[PDB]
DNA sequence: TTGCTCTCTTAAGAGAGCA
DNA sequence: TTGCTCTCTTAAGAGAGCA
């Protein structure tokens, strides 16, 4: 009368795919020596009795014996520290924690296929705080997409800067990494991914380095962008919003140097690029709030990318100098602007940072180009 | 066509566990039926499949009774799928499939192992003071991270900011406390785990005066995983309502001229221009504030990620104007104060020199704190 | 001296557990009257003692009451000892024990978390033919894995040699054979876990050709926590006999002159000189051996590290008398072929020819692998 | 008549300090609800009815039903799967983990205190392999002789070579890892471990970056050094073997550069000395059977210091000029070297590597000094 | 040759009486 | 004011009869 019948429970197994809904093992086998094995236990939100863990007078257990949102697959161990603490493990969130377990679970089951790629983690160590990127995010911001792999992929992490902050020997690094390193261990997978699979790539790294990765892989093979956001992690945004106007003044004749200035994160001040370029004329690519959270989606880096594309055709075409670069945009748009970089602008760009070494100036550090 | 392939009843329940449940095809959930009332008819609802053919036409290749052995080379899918199935007689597919089937099983369990993707780094910081009239125990930081998602595996680390000596909250006081932060923080991060090795995720409080929090902040950085906690005067722990919309964030330019750049954050409550006059002279006031100011205006953590958003829009619009810094007299709730800090952690940064109300002179504006190019 | 402290008896069980039931000054067990089959009086072999004064005499300078509600600050100690700890009237320690406590807590801890440092990855690696006629199972690894403490956490790896094509055994086919190990070895050591976040051990085994075998040890090296197992033609993954001491590997050395030197290793059985000679013409033979050459000698894995010092010891010896390349003849068991290729992945590289026997045309000694300056 | 007393179960959950016998969690306490709970469960290797999991009909279940030689504390979840898989978790393998484990907690409980260091291990990526020092093998070595600290403690990996092999950068990073990653990591520490606390440290790194390592930390600290073992890790080979002879073959007279060859791992060839020091003075220290296991014990260690120590001030004595060395030697002893040269040897001292690049030449790395 | 039921097994926390 | 006993609770795998 109280006891959960077989159909249920298979029901409940099922819709667990066979893991723990409150840690995640895999209940379905022992990887320890060998056995395929159901190890789980289905257990009851609200007891049967009203003096169990979470009892209430005001429950008809016979009405709810069968009801899958009276019931989770846990493990034993989970199962038995949710029935001794029951003030910790209270009805309310364990309910819902199981409808939200659930609901991924369907997610999942109801994505179409939508290929493979290889996941790419780039990032860097120059921040004065710990910058790490999961690799479970990525993976998931792929699945929701209906992409998989075969790994968990490649994640690179870049050397710090050493004593002497941002010198020579640490952009020599930083092109080993993304020229030698990333290619050394897409070699090492051979043939499992193909001969040109695509590289799901999020980074958050120097804006000159991402540029740099950007050229690298932008013909070398097919690409998915992703991105890491302040709130929302790898997730997008928000798949429905519009992508900002992207603003755009010319540089004013002349024969000083030609520079562009990228105002999408931030504003650059103006009185900051003729600090370190003095004689500067300066064009310019903006949005009208520049702020740190406007990579709201995948249409926010095309629409970029479409309109950075046409400027800068426009800006080789000025001068046969070099184009010096003052950007302060996010981590998958320093990306895609490298990308560009490949063949169809073949000028050479000299990449302005930031110097914490020099009371945050702007000096120059990579050169990219033919 | 034509085909159907055997199997006992252990390998049903197996196949149709690890598929969840669903057509791999279409993706229709075959439970139906039982959600409907009615009993479940395993074997009619669905059919099981192998995923790849024993070789050309119905011809084994390869030893096809050995893969098939495997259940994990076994499909479920819906009749009407299976029906467009094309077959050899034991029920084998004609055209492979195991892409498409190790590419479902493997969305499945990426879904099904999330929750490891909580563990979880427990960390409260707190000054002395309110330590004493205000400690967080660590239960109850963990009870609401638990409510969430997210799960310990050690004890928490809970820090008290030393107080100042004669030297004041001077630089090295202020790296002491940076380097206490992160020396912790690092030999927790250093405890991967999980499914994939990840580093395990932040979860946060501070109860502080507001420079101190924003030193945390300073800290913890916001390019990780990372979760601010709050403590409420009425919720405690627990985030008073996670389906409230975030205020908007009114903001008032500064005058034009060349006083001093001041920036007043009235959150909490509305501050006083003559306060931060007396602390400031010749201050020129821009000013972020809600409608309604309130110390229980943090709701939910949306609530902080919004005044972070609104705030950088603003800040790099006053940066653009002047070189010089910025002064900041805020009026805002612990959780944002940490958030303040985390979001000027970039490469780039400008000087803020950041005003505490000194409890022990009238309240007056205090400034205590420096963050920038130094 | 003097007081003693009051505690329930739920507070003993935890203060005898965290203990480990042993007095923290002198390690006495003081369970020793149950092991004697008499009745345990838990509270008269032993006292509980908080581990920190109050403060100057007995005068609390903090909440001493706040501290000792943690029964992490509770000590456990023989009668014996208690009584030489000078005390005041409620029973606090006069003098601060609370270093060598928390010490004593600690080293109780790394060995009772010691089974999490058992975490491993299983790897099988056979060629094509061993794969055929003798298939290892991984579960045969996991038991011999489970039972000597390593545990695998998700699926092993079972990996297969293809066979070579026309260009035979060439580079291309040994560096595709090397990257495709690093390639399985280093996704799954990403996957950090336990107390420390330290990466997992492997297990690994192989059946395969004695050049290949030399490749897998060239790909997992000696340098990290690695374990070999091996293939007993009579006690499977199982060992034979732990107790068993290693033979001595005797040695020869080579006859003076300036033909090609040949390192002849004849542990599995007796290599004849004619068969090196038909391949190495003018070889001079230099043969480490064991008394009753055996397939069976494998006992433990004390026998393989026993191998490997004898093996170094020779092989500096060997490259000291000449620069050019050291010929390999081998007649050794698998796990050793293993062990050969680990022990050649230093920085430093001397070059040596490996020789196999072609199953294909009688068995003759043919050279399909160099390992070395390249 | 079957079931276990209440002193017994006390006496397993003592005897194992609370923590799962076969996979060591701790059952004392829910660390993710925060509430200290006994969550394990006692398990019966052998079971009372012939039938169950391991039965056998020559057990004499009453005589055995509080003998804690059957019963191990375990977390539900392992002992769910013991019980299922009765062939995989076998009596005479349980038994054996059983005893192994309770003997790990009574050495740990006889262990005296013997103070208390920063646990350090360094270690290099130049090996075509992977190279991993476990934190938890350093923390049980200095468990053994008493030792303890306040935290896992400090882990730098060197970056790797990149495409040019270890050229000029590669050094350069070296030396930061040792001369400023090091150091930032112990300012970290702050006060926690005190003024001069002492180091713990065990390396597997480049033979000239382990004598920095050694130069770096010879003076500035007190050090206690481990050392990684082919076959027994981080444990000592054998606390009772004598250590071997360290022979010396003074240098011959003459105007050529002075050479320095320990020939302690494998015997060096002479050849590839004067190959790259055309006209060396060829001083050895040796031992009878060179090999790569000898580094059995501490006692090794300080041995082979006392004897370099002896000969380095007599080959300064030789020559105003430098003094070039060629080595093969365990990882440990070239840490011992390079804090033999703080103040006591101040001489110039040229340390040539074996080279990849240049066919397993000896070349110039790292110069180390005053 | 399941594939629903009711008994059985194994662990544990109360509850009573007593210590 | 435990601090040994026997009942109670919750999960599960057989075992029987039948489907
Ligand atoms: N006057 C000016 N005002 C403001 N910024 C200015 C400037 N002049 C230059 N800049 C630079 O523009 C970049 C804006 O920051 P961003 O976050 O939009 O983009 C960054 C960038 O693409 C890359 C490297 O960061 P960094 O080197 O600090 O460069 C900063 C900053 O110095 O990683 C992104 N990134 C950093 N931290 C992140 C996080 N937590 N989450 C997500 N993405 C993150
Ligand atoms: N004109 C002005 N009028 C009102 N406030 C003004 C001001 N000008 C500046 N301020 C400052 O704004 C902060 C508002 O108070 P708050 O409660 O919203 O946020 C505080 C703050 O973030 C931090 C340190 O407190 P304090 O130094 O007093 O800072 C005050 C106050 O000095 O901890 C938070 N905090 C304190 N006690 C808490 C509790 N019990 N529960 C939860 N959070 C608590
Ligand atoms: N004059 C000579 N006389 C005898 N052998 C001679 C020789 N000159 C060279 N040799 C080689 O010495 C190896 C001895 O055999 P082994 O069994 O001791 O070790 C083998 C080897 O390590 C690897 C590949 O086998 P193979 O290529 O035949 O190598 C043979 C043989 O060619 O796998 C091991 N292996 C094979 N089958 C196994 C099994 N069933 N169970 C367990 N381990 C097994
Ligand atoms: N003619 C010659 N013959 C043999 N060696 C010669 C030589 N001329 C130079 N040498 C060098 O002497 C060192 C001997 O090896 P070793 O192991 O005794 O000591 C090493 C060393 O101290 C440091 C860096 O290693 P590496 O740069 O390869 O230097 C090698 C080798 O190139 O780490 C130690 N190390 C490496 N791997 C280890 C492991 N798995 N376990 C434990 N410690 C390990
Ligand atoms: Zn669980
Ligand atoms: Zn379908
Ligand atoms: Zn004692
Ligand atoms: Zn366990």
New binding site residues.
């Given amino acids: 009368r109280?006891?959960?019948?077989?159909?249920t429970?298979?029901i409940?197994w099922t819709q667990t795919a066979g893991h723990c809904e409150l840690c995640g093992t895999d209940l379905t086998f022992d990887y320890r020596a060998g056995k395929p094995?159901?190890?789980?236990?289905?257990?009851?939100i609200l007891?049967?009795?009203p003096?169990?863990p979470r009892?209430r007078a005001d429950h008809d257990?016979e009405a709810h014996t069968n009801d899958t949102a009276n019931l989770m697959?846990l493990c034993?161990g989970c199962?038995?520290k949710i029935?001794?603490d029951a003030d910790g493990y209270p009805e309310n969130d364990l309910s819902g924690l199981h409808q939200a377990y659930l609901e991924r679970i369907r997610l999942a089951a109801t994505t179409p296929d939508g290929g493979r790629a290889i996941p790419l983690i780039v990032q860097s160590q120059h921040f004065q705080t710990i910058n790490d990127i999961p690799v479970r995010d990525l993976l998931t911001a792929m699945s929701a997409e209906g992409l998989t792999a075969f790994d968990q992929g490649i994640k690179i992490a870049f050397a710090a800067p050493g004593p002497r902050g941002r010198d020579t020997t640490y952009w020599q690094n930083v092109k080993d990494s993304v020229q030698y390193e990333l290619e050394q261990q897409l070699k090492r997978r051979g043939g499992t991914y193909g001969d040109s699979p695509a590289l799901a790539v999020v980074g958050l790294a120097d804006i000159p380095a991402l540029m740099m990765l950007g050229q690298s892989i932008g013909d070398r093979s097919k690409r998915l962008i992703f991105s890491f956001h302040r709130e929302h992690l790898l997730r997008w945004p928000d798949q429905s919003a519009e992508p900002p106007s992207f603003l755009f003044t010319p540089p004013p004749n002349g024969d000083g140097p030609l520079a562009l200035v990228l105002s999408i994160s931030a504003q650059v001040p103006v009185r900051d690029v003729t600090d370190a370029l003095p004689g500067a004329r300066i064009a310019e690519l903006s949005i009208p709030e520049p702020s740190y959270a406007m990579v709201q989606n995948r249409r926010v880096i095309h629409a970029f990318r479409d309109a950075l594309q046409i400027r800068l055709s426009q800006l080789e075409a000025l001068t046969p100098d070099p184009i010096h670069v003052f950007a302060a945009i996010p981590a998958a748009l320093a990306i895609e602007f490298g990308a560009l970089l490949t063949t169809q602008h073949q000028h050479t760009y000299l990449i302005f940072d930031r110097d914490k070494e020099n009371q945050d100036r702007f000096t120059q550090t990579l050169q990219l180009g033919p």
Avoid: C, I, Q, Y
């Avoid at 109280?2 to 159909?7: A, G, H, L, S, V």
């Avoid at 094995?37 to 009851?44: I, L, P, T």
């Fill in positions: 109280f006891n959960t019948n077989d159909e429970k298979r409940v094995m159901k190890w789980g236990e289905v257990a009851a007891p049967a009795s003096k169990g009892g257990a697959l034993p199962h038995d029935d001794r």
